[PDB]
């Protein structure tokens, strides 16, 4: 009676970096809801592109120590704060972001000079605290990859400190199945529950996961253009002893073993 | 250089060259002394006036059981300085995270407290202030206040940084080890990763335990390690 | 479910020294039995030795079962089932690997 | 002052330090076992039976560890004390099999 339709039943935004969304898909035949929920969860967790800082270059700072003057936070803690920055972007490849700031004050995500296609989800995120009137320039490395992907190149070693950034824009995902019976009408209802870090709304993550899943199974529909006698043994057939020993050394006992390896043939072909 | 102003007070009573396990009849003014609180004892070191409480006067020192008035004389085991010095005070101990019994409602599930067994007083290089742009810790002169023995000594520090006494102090890295007994100075570029430090200690311990476990086998003498 | 603990034939790890201890017990039992036939020991002395030498061996194998599991195969499926207290005890495992 | 001070082996004691394959007991420090009772200074029940006894435990039990340890020995990944892996080495293999 009904058609397969989806709807958002719950939608909460109790943060600038924590969005919640619950979605319903119905009616579904028996066994389909589990398949959709499993695949969608995999797409949401790793197949969705995420943008975050991967490397940090401390320009004009030859200290190379764990701490620098004028900044309360240690160098390692600054990288930790950078790793928490939530970014949304459509960039292809890699870009460069710069943080050149004044003396005393608070360095926040609002102070990051951004490449054209990227945005700061929450500009209030704290990077570092400045005490002494000293300028600080930071060379960021903005990259956009999937959660499941892995990268090995790390700019070798040129005083650029790598940031082990996790590329998940969907913090968590879960699916639930509700089955309703009417005597013989077994329909299933699929609930999709998505948590995002604000880089994309849960409704958007639902569409991207669906599109990424479809793009995976499109190639299976691709087409390409067109252009215009174990029971007989070598013992029985009369063979020279020289040839017989050579075959026996190579575990060629039957004739099938002989044809599987490639005046021997002249005598053999007649029988 | 950079000697601190050698001022003199009126209540100054020098305790140098006194018996250790004996108490003093009089009572000292705690405002004039640094109060070092440890697990087994409370340690007092004369505090000359200063904008920041960094100047220590080791001429008179007192040790008392924690939160008690009966002062005593610490067991000095090293030639403590006779001049005012600036020492960075950093404690050394363990966290005693315990699960107390629960009888009253809403009693805490855990009780986390820090127990101090030793306190390190690292002299500032040339007695320079913390706010000084040229501040750096002189790791040669470190004093250890042990709670268990209620004694204060000087750290036996091994300097492995190439450069001798003329080296650059900014590259020093004091490595305290063996229950605050082995002090070693190494170059900062040679710092061990904290993961390496933990794994190294675990590998040594388990290797000895594995050998003892395998020692009872009767073919141990004709077996290899790998 | 995710870890999927499961026991196999070789998961039933036996003490490495069981072969030595059993062989040593057999030698003592055989030597004593031979002299019992000679008349150097009487029946009760043979009876006690047979019971005690095999009970001491069995208890020693049970005693050394846990330290062997801990020191060599801590994640042995049979060990984790009993050591964690989930199912079975040392005595029941001893019936399997001792 | 007086509290400030300004500033490897080879073969054994270096393989042992680094964990590289080495004998458990240093061959240069292995004392030769002294002569013992010669079955005439000893009571009965401690003498060798003068004729080896069939035990049913005379063969070492086949193990996964022995096969892999022998396979690793010829590859050079491991260096065993002898041709055949001892029960100590097989037990050690289980601890470090992964």
């Amino acid at each position: 009676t009904r058609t397969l339709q989806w709807k958002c039943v719950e939608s909460r935004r109790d943060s600038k970096r924590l969005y919640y969304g619950r979605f319903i898909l119905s009616p579904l035949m028996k066994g389909q809801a589990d398949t959709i929920g499993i695949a969608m969860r995999r797409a949401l967790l790793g197949e969705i592109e995420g943008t975050c800082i991967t490397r940090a270059k401390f320009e004009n700072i030859p200290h190379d120590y764990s701490n620098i003057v004028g900044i309360q936070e240690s160098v390692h803690e600054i990288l930790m704060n950078l790793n928490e920055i939530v970014l949304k972007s459509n960039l292809y490849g890699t870009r460069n972001a710069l943080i050149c700031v004044q003396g005393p004050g608070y360095i926040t995500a609002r102070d990051i000079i951004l490449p054209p296609s990227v945005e700061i989800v929450d500009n209030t995120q704290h990077i570092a605290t400045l005490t002494e009137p000293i300028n600080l320039c930071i060379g960021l490395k903005i990259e956009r990859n999937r959660g499941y992907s892995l990268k090995m190149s790390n700019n070798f070693e040129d005083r650029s400190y790598p940031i082990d950034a996790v590329f998940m824009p969907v913090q968590n995902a879960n699916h639930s199945i509700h089955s309703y019976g009417n005597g013989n009408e077994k329909q299933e209802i699929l609930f999709i529950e998505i948590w995002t870090n604000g880089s994309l709304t849960p409704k958007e993550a639902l569409h991207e996961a669906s599109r990424n899943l479809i793009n995976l199974f499109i190639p299976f529909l691709h087409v390409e253009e067109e252009t215009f006698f174990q029971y007989i043994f070598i013992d029985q057939l009369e063979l020279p002893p020289r040839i017989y020993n050579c075959l026996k050394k190579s575990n060629i006992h039957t004739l099938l073993d002989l044809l599987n390896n490639s005046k021997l043939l002249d005598i053999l072909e007649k029988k | 250089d950079g000697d601190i102003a050698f001022v003199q007070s009126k209540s100054f009573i020098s305790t140098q060259g006194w018996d250790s396990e004996m108490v003093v009849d009089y009572r000292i003014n705690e405002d004039e002394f640094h109060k070092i609180s440890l697990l087994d004892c409370d340690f007092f070191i004369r505090k000359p006036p200063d904008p920041d409480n960094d100047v220590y006067d080791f001429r008179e020192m007192y040790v008392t059981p924690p939160d008690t008035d009966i002062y005593s004389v610490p067991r000095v085991l090293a030639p403590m300085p006779q001049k005012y010095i600036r020492c960075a005070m950093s404690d050394y101990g363990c966290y005693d995270v315990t699960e107390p019994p629960i009888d009253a409602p809403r009693d805490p599930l855990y009780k986390s407290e820090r127990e101090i067994s030793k306190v390190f007083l690292t002299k500032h290089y040339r007695n320079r202030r913390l706010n000084d742009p040229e501040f750096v810790l002189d790791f040669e002169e470190i004093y250890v206040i042990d709670s268990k023995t209620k004694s204060i000594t000087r750290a036996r520090v091994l300097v492995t940084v190439p450069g001798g006494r003329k080296r650059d102090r900014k590259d020093d890295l004091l490595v305290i080890r063996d229950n605050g007994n082995s002090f070693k100075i190494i170059h900062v570029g040679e710092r061990d990763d904290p993961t390496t430090v933990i794994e190294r200690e675990e590998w040594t311990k388990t290797r000895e335990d594995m050998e003892k476990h395998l020692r009872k086998l009767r073919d141990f003498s004709v077996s290899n390690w790998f | 479910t995710a870890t999927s603990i499961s026991l196999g034939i070789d998961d039933l790890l036996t003490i490495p020294s069981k072969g030595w201890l059993v062989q040593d017990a057999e030698q003592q039992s055989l030597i004593l039995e031979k002299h019992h036939h000679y008349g150097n020991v009487h029946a009760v002395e043979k009876l006690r030795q047979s019971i005690e030498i095999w009970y001491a061996t069995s208890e020693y194998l049970r005693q050394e079962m846990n330290p062997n599991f801990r020191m060599t195969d801590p994640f042995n499926p049979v060990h984790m089932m009993s050591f964690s207290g989930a199912r079975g005890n040392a005595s029941q495992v001893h019936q399997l690997v001792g | 002052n007086g509290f400030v001070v300004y500033n490897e082996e080879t073969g054994f004691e270096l393989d042992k330090k680094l964990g590289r394959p080495h004998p458990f007991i240093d061959p240069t420090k292995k004392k030769q076992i002294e002569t013992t009772l010669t079955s005439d200074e000893s009571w009965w029940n401690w003498r060798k039976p003068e004729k080896e006894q069939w035990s049913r435990w005379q063969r070492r039990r086949p193990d996964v560890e022995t096969v892999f340890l022998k396979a690793m020995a010829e590859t050079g990944q491991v260096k065993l004390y002898g041709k055949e892996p001892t029960l100590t080495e097989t037990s050690l293999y289980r601890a470090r099999r992964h």
């Binding site: 930790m80 | 794994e199 675990e202 590998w203 | 870890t3 | 330090k17 680094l18 992964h98």
Partner: peptide, 29 residues
């Protein structure tokens, strides 16, 4: 109880974790 035991059965330590004597990721949350 088995599942919880496996969860809390932490890292391999010492000689069970490294082949040789030494002589890891950081997560912000």
């Amino acid at each position: 109880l088995i599942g919880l035991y496996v969860l809390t059965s932490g890292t391999r330590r010492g000689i069970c974790a490294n082949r040789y004597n030494p002589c890891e990721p950081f997560f912000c949350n």
